[PDB]
Design a protein around this ligand. Structure first.
Ligand SMILES: [Cl-]
Ligand SMILES: [Cl-]
Ligand SMILES: [Mg+2]
Ligand SMILES: [Mg+2]
Ligand SMILES: [Mg+2]
Ligand SMILES: [Mg+2]
Ligand SMILES: [Mg+2]
Ligand SMILES: [Mg+2]
Ligand SMILES: [Mg+2]
Ligand SMILES: [Mg+2]
Ligand SMILES: [Mg+2]
Ligand SMILES: [Mg+2]
Ligand SMILES: [Mg+2]
Ligand SMILES: [Mg+2]
Ligand SMILES: [Mg+2]
Ligand SMILES: [Mg+2]
Ligand code: NA
Ligand code: NA
Ligand code: NA
Ligand code: NA
Ligand code: NA
Ligand code: NA
Ligand code: NA
Ligand code: NA
Ligand code: NA
Ligand code: NA
Ligand code: NA
Ligand SMILES: [Sr+2]
Ligand SMILES: [Sr+2]
Ligand SMILES: [Sr+2]
Ligand SMILES: [Sr+2]
Ligand SMILES: [Sr+2]
Ligand SMILES: [Sr+2]
Ligand SMILES: [Sr+2]
Ligand SMILES: [Sr+2]
Ligand SMILES: [Sr+2]
Ligand SMILES: [Sr+2]
Ligand SMILES: [Sr+2]
Ligand SMILES: [Sr+2]
Ligand SMILES: [Sr+2]
Ligand SMILES: [Sr+2]
Ligand SMILES: [Sr+2]
Ligand SMILES: [Sr+2]
Ligand SMILES: [Sr+2]
Ligand SMILES: [Sr+2]
Ligand SMILES: [Sr+2]
Ligand SMILES: [Sr+2]
Ligand SMILES: [Sr+2]
Ligand SMILES: [Sr+2]
Ligand SMILES: [Sr+2]
Ligand SMILES: [Sr+2]
Ligand SMILES: [Sr+2]
Ligand SMILES: [Sr+2]
Ligand SMILES: [Sr+2]
Ligand SMILES: [Sr+2]
Lengths: 82, 81, 46, 143, 56
RNA sequence: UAUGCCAGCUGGUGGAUUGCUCGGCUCAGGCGCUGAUGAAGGACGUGCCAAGCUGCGAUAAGCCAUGGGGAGCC
RNA sequence: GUGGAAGUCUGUUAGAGUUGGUGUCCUACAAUACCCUCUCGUGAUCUAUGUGUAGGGGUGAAAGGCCCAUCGAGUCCGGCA
RNA sequence: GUCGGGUGAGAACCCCGACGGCCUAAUGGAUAAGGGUUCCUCAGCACUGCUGAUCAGCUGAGGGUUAGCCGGUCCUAAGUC
RNA sequence: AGGGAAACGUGAUUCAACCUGGGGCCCAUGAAAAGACGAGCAUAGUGUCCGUACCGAGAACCGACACAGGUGUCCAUGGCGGCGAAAGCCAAGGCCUGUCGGGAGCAACCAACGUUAGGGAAUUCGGCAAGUUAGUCCCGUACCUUCGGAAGAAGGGAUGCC
RNA sequence: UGUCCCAACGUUGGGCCCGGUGAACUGUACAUUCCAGUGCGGAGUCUGGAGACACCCAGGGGGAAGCGAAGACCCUAUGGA
């Protein structure tokens, strides 16, 4: 478990009316990488969902501090706002 | 010669009408009037018919909802057939 | 629309006919309703 | 579990739009077992099923604006969209004026201040559009 | 407005119906005449030799 | 030697071919009117379970009499 | 000043229509569609339902227009191989 | 649309909550014609569904439309027999 | 009586519905019949027959389709806005089914569209396309005219908030 | 005033790659062609040369006198209306 800062600028590669969706993807990919786990095994607490969609589908925050824990027999992570 | 009462219409909705409103339901001849249905019923089970409501069904038959007087008990009447 | 009593009888018959060929007929004839109709895809008379 | 049927019964039992009924996330199993309207009312009393509140538009911002305008503000050339006669119906305004002038003249007469003949002469002048308003009429009566 | 598809949407009038006499859906409920058996037009049954090949 | 060409083998697909015939086609002989005593035709019913066909008509795949027939039938 | 006329004006009110884009589509969403622009919108107005007029005949503020995707003579079957 | 969760052999699209959105003469409410059981319930996924499907206007089986006072029914219109 | 967890109001303005009057127009004159009233009251009995579900549409209708088409009525008084049944935003209510998704700063090319220095129609058959102007108030307004009009001619100025 | 000088950068949906679904047009045969010539005088196929290792992806459409319609124009028929 640790606190990480996820940059979401790569969401700008996606059409602007759908930045929120892409952000949620970048978050899952960032965590899976940095906590060495499969993306399928990363759980995003709704808090993170609300953070990214705060200003609607077309306005994601540039970064987001997220608190994630890693564990269990198969290796998985759980994340949430901070 | 066609008879008036064809057969009892037994379904959940019918049972409720019988248990909660002292009403009996029958499939009757589509040429029978509310009055002819009232008579036939009184003469077949010996009871007092108070009201009769009818409906020409999408099954091609006429359905009758016959309410009996408080003096009679539908549940018991129907229980002997 | 408004259906007369006779129209109603006819619609009723069409509905009834629109059923499966009983399972037991299958066995007895050792192996399909050709008059199967759909309310949307088909059109009844009148 | 599929609770769309229950959603419909709850909307009717709670007398609210279906989009406003809330089903407790932790009781899908119990709600799914609800078959009758009675089963639904039961779960309502338990609070497992509730009606979300409907909103009403705030009128606070409108009220402040209404006050400014009632005081005569926020109605300069730049805030008008309709034609003058559209902002104030002219025939309607004439009806207001002429009636006020005739009521005035009628009070002065019965009061004694004006003789039927003086009243007549003024009444016909008013009807001919001689006075801009009541005050204009009074100022005239005072010779 | 085209005579085709767009003009087909205006068609919700009932004309030909099940005929009391012959059973065909040809009893024109406005004219009260069956275009198939002649009911409403003639006591005799509607019939014509052109309904078949001349020598048959 | 990949992509692939030609012919064949095993297995498909397809339903030709051959064989079969509860259906047709044509000829011949016999026979030949029905209906207000409501025909012909149609509709809707009618079965333990019954959608189609056939039969039948609220006495609804049937009721009665006489003769035939026969240990099976529905 | 009053009054409130008008085959009167503006108007994507409803509703009716369609100048241009020779745009989009052109094995279409559609055998006549889509978008923007455009015109009419108290009257020779628009609109629903009922009803009448039938094929060398109707109906036509006339374009040989329209009479069920078909009209300088409908459609069906027959004449007919 | 997205994040969690429910059910299930199986879930991007079946259901719950949250967050995010769309529709305001309509994408909401009541209905005429027309359709004809498409309505409700249970059980299903070979068929039908622009992908999938545990879903459904699909498949199997049951159930559902109750009137002196709402229509019809009565009157007559153009007009028809 | 009912309904509501509860309170279970009172006044006002603007007033759809509905009621009742006044005016004007016609080389146009705006149905008929059944029925009702006229013609009281009590009590009692009778009131049969047919329709009744559901859709009513970017999937229940017609268009071969779960078709971007076509298809009548009433909801025309929900809030801000403004002249407004206009735009835009928001309730009540409905929906995420104008039903395939996943991925590449996601190239060429195409459909729709935004911004372009200086020149400003040189482009083109042709300003086609796009743009310019724009609401409201004040000043002011030519030729011509059938004296109605032309006319919002043109041109000029103003416009927020407190 | 990007119509033009003279084009540029950007936005949304496609296009491209992946999962699933999954048609049609068209097809005498052969077919890697190019330059000339020849031929019913407008040839991928004949003749002479030249060039040419096979397969695949994307592209804009030069050619197949490309695909789509037994030429509408013109003439002819002891044709039609
Ligand atoms: Cl009704
Ligand atoms: Cl008055
Ligand atoms: Mg958006
Ligand atoms: Mg009834
Ligand atoms: Mg059924
Ligand atoms: Mg289910
Ligand atoms: Mg005036
Ligand atoms: Mg008409
Ligand atoms: Mg659709
Ligand atoms: Mg420039
Ligand atoms: Mg030039
Ligand atoms: Mg232009
Ligand atoms: Mg060519
Ligand atoms: Mg030719
Ligand atoms: Mg010619
Ligand atoms: Mg000739
Ligand atoms: Na029965
Ligand atoms: Na149908
Ligand atoms: Na004979
Ligand atoms: Na049967
Ligand atoms: Na005057
Ligand atoms: Na146009
Ligand atoms: Na003719
Ligand atoms: Na308003
Ligand atoms: Na879907
Ligand atoms: Na440009
Ligand atoms: Na080419
Ligand atoms: Sr049934
Ligand atoms: Sr259809
Ligand atoms: Sr026209
Ligand atoms: Sr159209
Ligand atoms: Sr119509
Ligand atoms: Sr006749
Ligand atoms: Sr004959
Ligand atoms: Sr006008
Ligand atoms: Sr106008
Ligand atoms: Sr043009
Ligand atoms: Sr354009
Ligand atoms: Sr076209
Ligand atoms: Sr007006
Ligand atoms: Sr035509
Ligand atoms: Sr012929
Ligand atoms: Sr609607
Ligand atoms: Sr399966
Ligand atoms: Sr349903
Ligand atoms: Sr008033
Ligand atoms: Sr109803
Ligand atoms: Sr529509
Ligand atoms: Sr809402
Ligand atoms: Sr789907
Ligand atoms: Sr800029
Ligand atoms: Sr020029
Ligand atoms: Sr020039
Ligand atoms: Sr100006
Ligand atoms: Sr290409």
């Amino acid at each position: 478990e640790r606190v990480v800062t996820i940059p979401l600028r790569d969401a700008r590669a996606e059409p602007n009316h759908k930045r929120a969706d892409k952000a949620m993807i970048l978050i899952r990919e960032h965590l899976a990488k940095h906590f060495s786990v499969d993306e399928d095994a990363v759980r995003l607490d709704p808090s993170i969902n609300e953070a990214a969609w705060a200003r609607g589908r077309a306005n994601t925050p540039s970064k987001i501090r997220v608190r994630a824990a890693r564990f269990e027999e198969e290796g998985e992570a759980i994340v949430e706002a901070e | 010669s066609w008879d008036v009462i064809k057969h009892p219409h037994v379904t959940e909705k019918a049972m409720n009408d019988m248990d909660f409103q002292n009403k009996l339901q029958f499939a009757v001849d589509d040429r029978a009037s509310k009055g002819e249905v009232a008579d036939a019923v009184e003469e077949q089970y010996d009871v007092t018919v108070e009201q009769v409501n009818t409906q020409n069904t999408m099954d091609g038959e006429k359905k009758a909802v016959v309410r009996l007087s408080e003096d009679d008990d539908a549940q018991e009447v129907a229980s002997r057939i | 629309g408004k259906k007369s009593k006779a129209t109603k009888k006819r619609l009723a018959k069409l509905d009834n006919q629109n059923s499966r060929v009983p399972a037991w007929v299958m066995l007895k004839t050792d192996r399909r309703n050709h008059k199967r109709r759909h309310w949307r895809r088909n059109d009844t008379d009148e | 579990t599929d609770l769309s049927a229950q959603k419909r019964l709850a909307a009717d039992v709670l007398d609210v739009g279906k989009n406003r009924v809330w089903f407790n996330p932790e009781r899908q199993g119990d709600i799914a077992d609800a078959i009758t309207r009675e089963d639904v009312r039961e779960l309502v009393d338990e609070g497992a099923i509730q009606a979300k509140d409907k909103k009403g538009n705030s009128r606070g911002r409108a009220r402040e604006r209404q006050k400014k305008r009632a005081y005569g503000h926020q109605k300069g050339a730049g805030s008008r969209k309709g034609k003058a006669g559209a902002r104030q119906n002219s025939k309607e305004d004439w009806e207001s004026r002429i009636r006020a002038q005739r009521t005035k003249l009628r009070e002065l007469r019965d009061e004694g201040t004006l003789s039927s003949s003086q009243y007549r002469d003024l009444y016909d002048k008013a009807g001919g559009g001689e006075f801009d308003s009541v005050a204009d009429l009074e100022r005239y009566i005072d010779a | 407005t085209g005579a085709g598809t767009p003009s087909q949407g205006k068609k919700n009038t009932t004309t030909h119906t099940k005929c009391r006499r012959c059973g065909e859906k040809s009893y024109h409920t406005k004219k009260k005449v069956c275009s198939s058996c002649g009911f409403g037009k003639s006591a005799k049954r509607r019939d014509y030799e052109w309904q078949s090949k001349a020598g048959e």
